[PDB]
Amino acid sequence: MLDAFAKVVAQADARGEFLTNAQFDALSNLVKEGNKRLDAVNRITSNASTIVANAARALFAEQPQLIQPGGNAYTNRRMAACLRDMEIILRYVTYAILAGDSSVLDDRCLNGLRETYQALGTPGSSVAVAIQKMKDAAIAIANDPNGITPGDCSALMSEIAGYFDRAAAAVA
Amino acid sequence: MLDAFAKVVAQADARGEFLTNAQFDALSNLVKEGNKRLDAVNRITSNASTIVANAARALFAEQPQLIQPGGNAYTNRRMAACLRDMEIILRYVTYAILAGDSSVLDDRCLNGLRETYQALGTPGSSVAVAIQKMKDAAIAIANDPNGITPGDCSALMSEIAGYFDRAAAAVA
Amino acid sequence: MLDAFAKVVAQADARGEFLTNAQFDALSNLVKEGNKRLDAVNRITSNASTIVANAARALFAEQPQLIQPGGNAYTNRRMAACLRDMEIILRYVTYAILAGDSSVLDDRCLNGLRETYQALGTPGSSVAVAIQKMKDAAIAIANDPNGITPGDCSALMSEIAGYFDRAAAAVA
Amino acid sequence: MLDAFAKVVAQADARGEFLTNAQFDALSNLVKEGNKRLDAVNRITSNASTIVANAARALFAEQPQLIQPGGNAYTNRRMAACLRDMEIILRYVTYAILAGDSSVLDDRCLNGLRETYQALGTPGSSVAVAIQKMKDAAIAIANDPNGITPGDCSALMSEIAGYFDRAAAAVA
Amino acid sequence: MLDAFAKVVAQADARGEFLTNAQFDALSNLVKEGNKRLDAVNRITSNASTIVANAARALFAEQPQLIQPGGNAYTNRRMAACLRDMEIILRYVTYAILAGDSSVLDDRCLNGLRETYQALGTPGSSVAVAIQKMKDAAIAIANDPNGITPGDCSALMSEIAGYFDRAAAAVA
Amino acid sequence: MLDAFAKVVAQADARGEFLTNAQFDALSNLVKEGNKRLDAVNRITSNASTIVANAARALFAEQPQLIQPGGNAYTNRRMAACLRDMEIILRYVTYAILAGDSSVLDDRCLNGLRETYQALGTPGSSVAVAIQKMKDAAIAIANDPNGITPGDCSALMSEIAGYFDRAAAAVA
Amino acid sequence: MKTPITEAIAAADTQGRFLSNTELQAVDGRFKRAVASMEAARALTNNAQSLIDGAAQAVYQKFPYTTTMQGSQYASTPEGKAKCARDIGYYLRMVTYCLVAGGTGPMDEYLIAGLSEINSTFDLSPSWYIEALKYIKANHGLTGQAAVEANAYIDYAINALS
Amino acid sequence: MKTPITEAIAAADTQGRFLSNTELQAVDGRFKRAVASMEAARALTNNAQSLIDGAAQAVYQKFPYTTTMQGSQYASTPEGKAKCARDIGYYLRMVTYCLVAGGTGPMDEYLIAGLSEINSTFDLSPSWYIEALKYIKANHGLTGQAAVEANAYIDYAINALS
Amino acid sequence: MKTPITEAIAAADTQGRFLSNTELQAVDGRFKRAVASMEAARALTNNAQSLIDGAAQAVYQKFPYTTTMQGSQYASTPEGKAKCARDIGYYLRMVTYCLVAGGTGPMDEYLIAGLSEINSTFDLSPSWYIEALKYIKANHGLTGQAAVEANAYIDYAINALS
Amino acid sequence: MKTPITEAIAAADTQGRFLSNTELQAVDGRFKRAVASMEAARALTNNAQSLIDGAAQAVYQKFPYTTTMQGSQYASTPEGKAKCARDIGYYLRMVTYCLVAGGTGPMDEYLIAGLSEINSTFDLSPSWYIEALKYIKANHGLTGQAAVEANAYIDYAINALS
Amino acid sequence: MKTPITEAIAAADTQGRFLSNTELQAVDGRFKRAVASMEAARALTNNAQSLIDGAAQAVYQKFPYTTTMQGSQYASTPEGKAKCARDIGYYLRMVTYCLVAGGTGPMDEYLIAGLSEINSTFDLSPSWYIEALKYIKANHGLTGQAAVEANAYIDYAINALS
Amino acid sequence: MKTPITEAIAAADTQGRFLSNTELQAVDGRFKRAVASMEAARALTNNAQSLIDGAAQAVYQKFPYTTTMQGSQYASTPEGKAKCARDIGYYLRMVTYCLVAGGTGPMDEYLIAGLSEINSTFDLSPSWYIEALKYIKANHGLTGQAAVEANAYIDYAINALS
Numbered sequence A, B, C, D, E, F: 001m002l003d004a005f006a007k008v009v010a011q012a013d014a015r016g017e018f019l020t021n022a023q024f025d026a027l028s029n030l031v032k033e034g035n036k037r038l039d040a041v042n043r044i045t046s047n048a049s050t051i052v053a054n055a056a057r058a059l060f061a062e063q064p065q066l067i068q069p070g071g072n073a074y075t076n077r078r079m080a081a082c083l084r085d086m087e088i089i090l091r092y093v094t095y096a097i098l099a100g101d102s103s104v105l106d107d108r109c110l111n112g113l114r115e116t117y118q119a120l121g122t123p124g125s126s127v128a129v130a131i132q133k134m135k136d137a138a139i140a141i142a143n144d145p146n147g148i149t150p151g152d153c154s155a156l157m158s159e160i161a162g163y164f165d166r167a168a169a170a171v172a
Numbered sequence G, H, I, J, K, L: 001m002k003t004p005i006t007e008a009i010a011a012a013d014t015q016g017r018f019l020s021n022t023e024l025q026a027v028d029g030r031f032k033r034a035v036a037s038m039e040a041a042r043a044l045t046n047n048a049q050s051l052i053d054g055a056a057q058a059v060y061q062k063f064p065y066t067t068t069m070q071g072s073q074y075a076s077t078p079e080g081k082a083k084c085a086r087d088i089g090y091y092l093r094m095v096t097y098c099l100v101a102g103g104t105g106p107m108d109e110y111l112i113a114g115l116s117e118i119n120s121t122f123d124l125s126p127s128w129y130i131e132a133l134k135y136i137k138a139n140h141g142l143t144g145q146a147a148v149e150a151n152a153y154i155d156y157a158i159n160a161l162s
Ligand SMILES: CCC1=C(C)/C(=C/C2=NC(=C\c3[nH]c(/C=C4\NC(=O)[C@H](C)[C@H]4CC)c(C)c3CCC(=O)O)/C(CCC(=O)O)=C2C)NC1=O
Pocket: B032, B033, B034, B035, B036, B037, B038, B039, B040, B042, B142, B143, B144, B145, B148, B149, B150, B151, B152, B153, B156, G021, G024, G025, G028, H033, H144, H145, H148
């Protein structure tokens, strides 16, 4: 996998180039913004069980078909699998947030997932709805102004939304 | 795999339903008929080596091309493989008879077998002829009126023919 | 794998036939010519490191794109892989020379190699150019008249060229 | 492993002998007594979680040292291991009851267990006390006169006590 | 493993020495005697099934206890194991003959064999008697003057006896 | 493994105790001294190849027997093994320095090493001499006053000597 | 799915062997026991509603807080009451299925696998379900071997939750 | 040793599980079938000598060369006759053991494992033993389910030799 | 035990490598964060008794049945009250240990491994402990990065119980 | 197929190595021995019919029952006689192939693999074929190293059947 | 690519776990050290040409034969001089990349993997490159922690070549 | 140790087989080639000192810096000269051993395994040894197949260093 710094290096290396002042500046800015990124990861991780549970409870309230006998989340084995997938997706999104790059999410989680669900008969559209609900909950938790030194994390929130949106698109 | 009882349950569960009186009655009838089913399995298994050998000898007498140099049953390694396949097929048919359901035969034996033979260049049509000969021999042995309490096993024989026919169709 | 003797047997066996006098004569001639074949293998193997190195140095002098940053032989890991492949190809060609048959080369080396390179983005055309250069060097070494009992190895050289040409065609 | 029938055969075979009328009679008596043995196994298995939990709670009430910080059942990992061992021991005792022979208990459970505990520093004496408590609970459950066709299971209870006593001696 | 040539080298290397004229002469003599050694190996190997069978039949005629019920060669699994061991021992002796050194026999066959038999309760003394009988049969076959260019193989026969004697001592 | 902080916790936990003010103070002091510890690790690691090479060259100059034919470091395979062991030992010592605890060194490196060398016939005394030479070189490098903010690292040097002494005692 | 017949087949198939008398005896044992097992299954099915209703109330009586405490995991709303009745009915349907199939396989596949995960994630107490099951056992009205059959599967569920 | 009881235990033990009703049904099937199986075992035992004697002669009649041909693998000497009678008695003792144990385990362990190797090494024809077994089946005098039991184990041996 | 220093070593050791700057940076991060972490650890330790006492009462207020219901798993006897206070003190001691060690390792080894098994076997509700932990988080009195440290380990325990 | 040349290559290829002199010596040994081996192969081929015919009769003389006994596995019909002559010719063709290839590979692949299974399934006696082979060895008419070559492969087949 | 952030993620991912504070501390350590590391990276980049030029000459002074000896592996032609300057620039670019990424990953992937093979195959002496690197270390002009950063990666390369 | 005889045995032993003619041919090839190989071995041994002395000087002439440059890895001191002469003699002794054993095994075990590691650690240039070996090949004075043997093992060493 790549983080944000590794990604710039990799691009440089393929050109055979040293970095430019602009590229150094960009990386230095990433470092300058690092405490915010650490806070987002900590907050989301610290709330992971509720983010998942609450999104699952909401999905099944809105999409009762999934928990009727014959539905894809019926039986405890299928419900446990569904809950696990929600935890997995959220785990890999948080890795992407720490890294400042989507590569770990794409490579270790999203690649092949659409095909996995199609072979199983799991409805990827409904997965996308569970991801969106975790996204909204995660962002509200990461961006809560209470109990933190005040500042603007809007760019980071947009980046975090991106990662969730990418997961949703990969399964939908 | 499923047996006949498991199959009814699985269907019930997908509907979220308790069984009906008709379904209970059907299963009770299966149990009532169980000694016949045990006799068929015992008889066929007890004769397995002759059923295979005799069907193989008859196939190769009718289809000498298979045992001419260059033929698919020429060399002892290919002949042993062919004999083994006949034993395998008969073994899985007898499992299906005990279970009262074709699932074990389909899943553990017949699925992919056509493709296996095509990749090898084994003539699946000739396999189907060996299966038919085992079918006829097996039925004659299971349904022999000598040495058993008299009764009508015609429905069971029709079911047993079915399983052999299914194997033949899967390779032909 | 097959050698030259095994190949004649295999063909015989598929027909169910004993060998003919002509086939015996052909094999006896192969044996008669064996010292030349051993000399070719010894010479080429004894020079393997220079044949590879010199062909690699020449390829990269002619095809500098391969060693520019971003090129497929840039970085030491990719250069080591490229050098290794050249050694592999030459190793399997020498096996084919000893055997008097291409089967080991085809089966253990060339099969799937085109697809391997396509998946990687390695330019099989450039591989073919490295093979041709090893071919010409190998033939010059095997066929050097100095330091060996004089005789005509022209048929063997044509056979050796064949094997290299087959490798080149498989990757190009 | 051996059951009670296999044990008689094994002994016979080492002598090269057919069974005697007395040995046949003994085995026939075992079969005659089989419903009692099945009831004991069912009862004990059906109560397994309470037999274990209640014996564990009683051990730790009597031997508080085991659950003080530094004690061998302190920390959840060690407590889970201790509970697991109690379940294991009871599982293997119930196998012995079904088999009518201690071999499965000796071979798959008790052999080496003393040495295992010594290497760990687990107090085998305290294990023996947990086994005795399960023994007394198991016997009371298996031998409960309520809810079963009345008869004398005293010989079976003596046999069941034996197996528990053997487990206790192996660890003490 | 070592052969006779490797053994001289290994000794040389530990001293840091080139070979002496005497050592070169010794190895050259070994090579000079090589056809005899090849004949012994061929003869013994070509007769391996009869050497084993005949020695086994003779052992059990002399030592009937081994094949009485309860005896260590009673049951087909134990008889097959005993026959296999005789084949193994003879196989490793023939390797030693080809190599002109006992190392392969010692390392891959005889080391630990006494302990193996003791743990099993196999009577190593009786094994030694089966080895001696194979030794005498093997020597008679290897040293048969009929059907071979006449010469003196007495030193080789003494060496071959040695290897069998070493196997016998390792198990007795 | 344990570091210095984990070791205090483990001790606390076995007593069931919260830490004391003195224990908190001790750990806080360790943290306060951390830059020195990081410098020692960096310096030694950065010089690892020369520390090993120079100690090996000195050992073999003083103990020529080890590199005479027949000696335990004669042949390139044994020399490579000896050099590797010196690198291993130094690697595990540096882990111990980072951790502030010998457990990783004891558990992953020193345990069983005496027995390993005895089985091989490697002279553990000579190993101890190579360790001592690396110790003296490592300390001189870690404690070099040039090119670093001045301060007293004497306690750390005594701790580092300890780890090397422990390795030496384990093999001698 | 684990039944005496699929266990028999699986054994023979692991070993690459035809069924032997060893397995056929096992299936005969199943067929004879099916008499008692089907009697239990039919009885539990016929009386399912009253057993489910009574069992839910047994839980609420044992655990009164489950009727009043605020939260979606409790039966303090009409939805929570419906979830609970649903779940008890699931346990009882599974018991009937085990009786029909002659083994634990239906319960194992449809209910026990993932059970611990679900109870944890959704904050459901195993003790709630143990109480429901103990009521069913006490009140199913069966006797003889039909009772022994039913109770074996009810106790299997209880053990799974303990 | 493969018996219905050891197969039941082994299944439970592979899965790390207590025995369930699935296994107990299997053992009950064994216990009920033991009635027929013990009847067969006692009968074969009581009539062992005549069955062994008759079976050996059936072999010699089918295969006359075995009484005249020179070699230690044939019954053309008193020792060979004794080896053959011994071996037939071994097959019949094993059948009795399978009947007592309720499965193939005794035959599998004491006779079938290595069978092919022994027959090859010592030049014994499987067809000799198949004939002996076919005589026993024809002449054991059993009826009903006792016959079915005996024949299942005799046919198992025949299949092992085919 | 999982700490930043043992994770760094383990990484280097898996790879058969000397520590590199990649690992040394990680340990420096630990050493700098230890300032906040030790402040939290000392505070929680100094106020341990009041936090434990208050947390137990928070549980009893949230879950009143735990003070009245009959059974040894409940705090309805002096022994049960003592077990509960003990257990809450265990959770808080573990949080202090994680703070001292700079990672989850102490909690993971001494408390989380086997947690689910213990709660099930002894009929202890995870929700009881979640409530205790939520009280500690609300009332520890820390601010700034010391609070962030404490809360990270308290929330880790809560997640382990969810 | 196992020949000295394919064994040499396989060794080098397992080790990821170029051929070395160690392997080239092995192939030279093959090439020199091929003189004797081809002489044997041509002789056996030229005299194949008489050897096959004589060998079949050797079997029938040793084992007279094979000419009279009823069953499709015996040579008591024209078809059985033809199967037997065919099979003997197969053994002799394989010996010729081993001689040409310089090793056992052709026999191993085309005849020995599955041999035991075929003989068992079709009730063919290994001793029949051993007799045929012993006749070929006795009567091939070869001398010197050509005889040694032929006999090595004939004895290899005999060992495979023993 | 090995960086403190990818090592942190990899650890969490191997264990199937969310990131914990143990990993977040590690990344913070990276972020704080990046101040010194970026200062080094920019300096080395800005002065790259003079360092490369000076380093090449240091090699030629230490090893004069490399300027005169015949062969394409030596810097005795304009092409060889250009290859050498290129290679030194590669080493220095990699050092800058390691500084930017906070670990050895770029050097490991793009330069060290296969290094030994390349040096052997093309007859390049590791000592040449060690000399170049020692010149860079001596003459980069850095002080304080920026120097410590640069030197750690330069010494890592030197160790890789030793 | 890899020799034609140990390779033959190893093949047979991997396959659990007796030696066959396939292997015996291989050993015969060894025995016939030993004539040429022993002639080479004796010649190289008899002329070892002059070859070693001449080879060392060939290295010093090709690489003059090795006689003057400061460092213990160079032949610029009496000790370094002695180490170098020693090492060349090691290479030549190994060639003699390979000739005696009929394969590469002695060189592989005593010299090639770990070679790359030693050359790197002690800063020894492979090109030094390649030059020595090329001198030996040029000046050993052998002809015919004895030369072919010697050169095969000398070129094997050269390839190992390339
Ligand atoms: C160890 C395994 C096992 C076996 C093998 C078994 C067989 C078995 N078959 C039986 C009957 C029977 N078997 C048959 C079967 C047939 N009748 C015919 O005329 C047909 C052609 C045929 C076709 C399959 C019938 C009709 C009965 C009596 C009715 C019944 O019991 O279902 C009976 C009852 C007793 C008897 O009448 O002999 C048993 C015990 N039970 C077992 O536990």
